[PDB]
Amino acid sequence: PLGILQSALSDLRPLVTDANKYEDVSAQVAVISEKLIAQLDIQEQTVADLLLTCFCQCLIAASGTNPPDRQGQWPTLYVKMLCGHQWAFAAVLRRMLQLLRFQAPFLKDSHIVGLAAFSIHLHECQPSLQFLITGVQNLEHYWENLLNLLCSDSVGVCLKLCTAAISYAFCRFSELHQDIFSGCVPPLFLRKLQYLVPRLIWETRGEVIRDDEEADSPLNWNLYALAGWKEAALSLWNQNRLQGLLREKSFQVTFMDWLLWEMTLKSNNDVLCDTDRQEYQRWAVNHYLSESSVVGGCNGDLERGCITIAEAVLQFSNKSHTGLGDILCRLQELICDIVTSHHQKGRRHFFFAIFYQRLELHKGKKELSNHLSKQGVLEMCCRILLGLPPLFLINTPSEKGIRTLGSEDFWQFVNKELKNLGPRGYALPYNITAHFFRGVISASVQCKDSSEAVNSILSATYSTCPALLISAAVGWPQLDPVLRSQWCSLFGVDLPKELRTLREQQASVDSCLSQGEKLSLSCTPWLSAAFLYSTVQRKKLPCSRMLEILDGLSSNFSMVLISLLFFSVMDIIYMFLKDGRKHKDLLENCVHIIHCLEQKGETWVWLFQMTDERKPELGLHLHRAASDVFLNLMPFAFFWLVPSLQLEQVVQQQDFLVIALDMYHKFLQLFVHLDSHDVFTCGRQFLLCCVPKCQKPNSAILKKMLESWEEHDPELAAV
Amino acid sequence: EPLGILQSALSDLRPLVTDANKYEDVSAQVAVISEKLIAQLDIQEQTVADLLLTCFCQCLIAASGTNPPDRQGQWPTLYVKMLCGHQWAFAAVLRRMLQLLRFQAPFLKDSHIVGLAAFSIHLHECQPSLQFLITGVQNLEHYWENLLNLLCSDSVGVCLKLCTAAISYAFCRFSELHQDIFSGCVPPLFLRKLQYLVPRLIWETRGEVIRDDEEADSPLNWNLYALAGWKEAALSLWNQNRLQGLLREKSFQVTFMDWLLWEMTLKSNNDVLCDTDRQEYQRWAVNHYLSESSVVGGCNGDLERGCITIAEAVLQFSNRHIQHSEWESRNISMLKSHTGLGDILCRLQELICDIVTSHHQKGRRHFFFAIFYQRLELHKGKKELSNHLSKQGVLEMCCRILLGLPPLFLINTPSEKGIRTLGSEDFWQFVNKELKNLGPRGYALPYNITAHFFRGVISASVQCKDSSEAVNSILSATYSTCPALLISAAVGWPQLDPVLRSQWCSLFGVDLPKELRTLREQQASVDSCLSQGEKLSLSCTPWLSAAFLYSTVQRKKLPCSRMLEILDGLSSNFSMVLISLLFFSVMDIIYMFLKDGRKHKDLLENCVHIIHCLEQKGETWVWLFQMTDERKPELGLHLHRAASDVFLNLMPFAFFWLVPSLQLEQVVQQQDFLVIALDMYHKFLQLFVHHLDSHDVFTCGRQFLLCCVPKCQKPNSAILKKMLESWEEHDPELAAV
């Protein structure tokens, strides 16, 4: 079956020497007549390399008699025959894939030219392949896959190839007006030889000289008797007809496609040393940075440069990576020229804007598919800030003869779209809450005092952006030596008065836990109850040894006992989302509640209310530090822990019923069972014994329906 | 049967060790007989090694459980002796140890590691174990670094689990005596990598120094055999008050340079830390070594010694990484993964931004440049081999560094009395000795080191009061001290203007100064008059206008005939443009020669056209060819001090191509001609020690000498034909003429 196939398919070469006078047809009829009978199986893995190779053979057979200009009426015919079938033309594609992926690094130097000429001739026939494993579209959705995988793994081959699917097309498909010629070759080959050449082959970047002695002449078809691959792709980049062709729009290269090619080329694959791979870029960036905007580029707007780089980085996420690090180093190389200038007119606002607009597209709530992309882009938004620090980009000083050091930005980004980033809820992670401190330490040099500015910053930080101090406290032990060393490195004097009170509080806590000394209180009941909580929770000590050491008689006591209830009902959850069912610390809260009762009341509902109607100050200094992933999930905890109490939760409380309903409304808007929604009866019971506004028996019968509002809104007016 | 008896013996040695049976050791001598009955990547046997090493690695863990090491016996010493007494097996086990540590580092157990660590310590105790027939290593000590400086780069989580069991075994074997001589049991190097790998991997022991003085007994009675992990066995040992008072001596002292030399070599891949976590470690360490004393090796609290010491290492780690490149004709050779380099250079700019941004600058920068004046003196001309020349691999790092910095460091910023004037005197004195780098052009620098400068003076005037009266002062002090920078702008204007303009418009929207503007005018008086022809303006300084014109021509691909017709004919500043236009063409010829050596005729025609265009005025063009400073008018120095020295060593190679292509009589009415001709021939010989051009020179510097200046009438051509003794007679002939 195949022996005769190899014979026939090999009986072609003798024909094509001089007698190529339309007789290469009946042999094609025979090829097709005998081909009728025949995971990369062996039937296909072998026939492919048999059809293809006949090309690499016949081409070289005929390229000795005459060049391709005059001959070349067989190839179109052979390829039209091949494409005439379906179960074979779909094997050559995958075979060439495997043959340029695995063996590509070393196959041959003349089994290549026998692949370009099969690419091109696969273009002038525009065949149909709508059905295939992956490629659903026409070829144009196949060249890009191949070329991209290849230039990501192997570079030298990509150029060895691109510069051979061109030279075969200025010889062939010549002698025709320059208006329709450009439709023969595909665009991407040129759109990529506009990129590779000046990367590998220097001397052609625009530095040295333009040598030209043979510019207007059909270049020699010498690839079969050549001298190297550095004069077949340079005797082409210097031909006028091409160098004047890389100006159309059908194939441009702009400063958002350069990245997505260079930002995915992993070292250990390239062919350039480090201190050349880091000159290519510094040349490129500074060539798409002095280029018009109608073309891909930005005139001189460093701002626009950084903007584009960030917008590209965000569009690649779709850990350890090497290429991305170079881009994130060029960011610094660019920015460090800004902070040392103190624009005061174009300031950090130009940057953060990007995030806000990349973070609105994912507002179309759906089936657990966009939230993921949201946090995935957010983690990258964070990784960046850690990748373009001179470490005080996040600081907005001023100038009126002095420098004030304020930071009016990064306080909104945090309060809005960063606090909902990491675990533990109320806190941030310990990789971004150190940049702010190691930044105020490093920007406190410009001023004249260097010990007062820091105090002003950290005194302002109490009102706005409190979620940073808590993230420090929760992560202080691995943060003290850092600063204690930085300061001594720069100045070498005592510390200020607002970076050591935290140390004093930690030390007091520690020295008081071992024995017990009725801990004091620094008039700040949402700080001094974070230390006290985190130390315990890390050293595994229980409750009894947590609040047994408070000395509250008339000072700030209830607040230090409510902050703990908050921090204790925001970690019942981190132990639910994290592969769990229920955690045993609610006893701590049932004890804190009894301790608040022993005092003069000091109600606890400020937490379980989302609006800002009458929530006292700390009650809205707390929720301004949480994450909207939890606050949308409190009712769960509310109805978990409530049933452990009765006969005092209402009759001596204020605004209970209202809050219970405000919650039970949201307990439904989550989904769209018996072990989760059982407080039906609970809410039904609290009514019969509550602060009777009207509540005679109406709301005891209305819970038998889905209208907690059909009559409640009016049933409150009678209060 | 060298095997059966072997396994029988190394098995009977198994149970006999659970108890320290007195005198039950001669059974070792039996293995001596067996081995004596049996005697690159060797694989001939390559099993005796494992057969003999597993004996230890198994008998140890088999006995341990009955008694701790100290009360174990005198077994391992005798074993190691019966091994080393045959210096062929001792030449193998080493090889298998290293081969299985490196290649299959992760594919190992948690019980064989200690079996190698204890064996290593026992080796160290038997120092008389010294072999010479092991290529690559002379003594024993070398082996330790040989394997560990590969382990600590290919895989870090095995240089810790192997350098902890050693200590946990030594502190259980020799922890009965040796109040002072304890130091000397373990090998030193082990006890250094710990001090570098423990904190890095785990943070709970970074900065804490003193917490208490509670006395301890010993680690948990050799718990490694049934440990619960390593984060607590490496931590129950860092606190042992007997150790922390041990890594203070000199032979266990890590330092700063010795740290950079190890962090650079970490492969980014195969590491264990995410890229956003191995930069906190560095941002901490760099600060932990700046607050120290110099006796330890760390800085004393300053910052200069913290940058000098990071540059002096990059200029010392690349030397062993020449790492050339080639793509066509690929020789299969993997590339070294992304080294920790770069990162270090990012923690070096977070530190320069803290001594230029301050309130007490006193902006001196003599340092950081005298550090480069040394590596270029280690091998000034040649390191006995032309592989890493000055302008090859050291002047490409004095740039990779000098770029990653801000564009302000290159400028001084004095603050004498708060006035804060501007200037530069340590980048000029230095760029006048790094222009020799760019051999491509010769009359220019590269571009990426010409933007920063012009982009710096603009980011420094800010600090001053009038941000547009210093620039006019700098760029006027220039034109007389550092020409080579402008001519690299002229050659690059159309890629540079939309940066300066945008910057000066983004800081504060005020009109430009009178020195970043003159250039736009001198460029627009060109890009137009080349179109359709009008005239040229001929601003004050010639050698800048000429650069503009010549480079613009080259960039637009025009011929070399417009350049000569759009020009004044009655101006006093005409010739001084043509001279420069000749100089640039010469240099272009010379560049074309150092690229597939040839001549590129057309330029030889351009130059003769120029010489004829300036010959009907009575001037003197033969003083470019004076490689001295004797009498060259001031226009010569301001050009030669911009030209590389790779080229002026070739100027003769271009003086005998376009001299004979002139008339034989219009190159003699000049002043002191032959004094350059023969003074250049003298240099045309030193090059040989092209070759076909020796004839044209031997004749052209031989026929002129008859109808030449009134210096000699005879015996000078005869003398020149005598031999290469032009000097022996010229030294006396020049006396008169």
Residue numbers in the entry:
A (entry chain B): 632 to 669, 693 to 972, 989 to 1342, 1356 to 1402
B (entry chain A): 631 to 669, 693 to 1342, 1355 to 1402
Paper lines:
The FA pathway is triggered by stalled DNA replication forks at ICLs, leading to the activation of the FA core ubiquitin ligase complex. However, the FANCA–FANCG–FAAP20 (AG20) subcomplex is essential for monoubiquitination of FANCD2 in vivo. FANCA and FANCG are critical for the localization of the FANC core complex. To understand the basis of the FA-associated FANCA mutations, we determined the cryo-electron microscopy (EM) structures of Xenopus laevis FANCA alone at 3.35 Å and 3.46 Å resolution and two distinct FANCA–FANCG complexes at 4.59 and 4.84 Å resolution, respectively.
One of the major classes corresponds to the dimer of the CTD of FANCA. The two structures of FANCA alone show that the FANCA CTD folds into an arc-shaped solenoid structure, which forms a pseudo-symmetric dimer. The side chains of FANCA are well-defined in the 3.35 Å EM density map, and clusters of bulky hydrophobic side chains unambiguously guided the tracing of residues 631–1370 (helix H3A to helix H13B). The FANCA CTD structure consists of a chimera of 14 HEAT repeats and three helical motifs (HMs) with two to four helices. The convex surface forms a wide and shallow groove (44 Å width, 35 Å length, 6 Å depth), through which the extensive dimer interface (6238 Å2) is created. The two FANCA CTDs interact in a head-to-tail manner, in which the arcC subdomain of FANCA’ CTD (green) interacts with the arcN subdomain of FANCA CTD (orange). The dimeric interface between the two FANCA CTD molecules includes an extended network of interactions involving more than 40 H-bonds, 10 ion-pairs and extensive hydrophobic and van der Waals contacts. At the center of the dimer, two parallel H8B helices run along the 2-fold rotation axis. Two Cys pairs (C999-C999 and C1006-C1006) are in close proximity, consistent with the results of the intermolecular crosslinking analysis using hydrogen peroxide and bis-maleimidoethane. The FANCA CTD structure reveals a long path decorated with a cluster of positively charged residues, providing a rationale for how FANCA might interact with DNA.
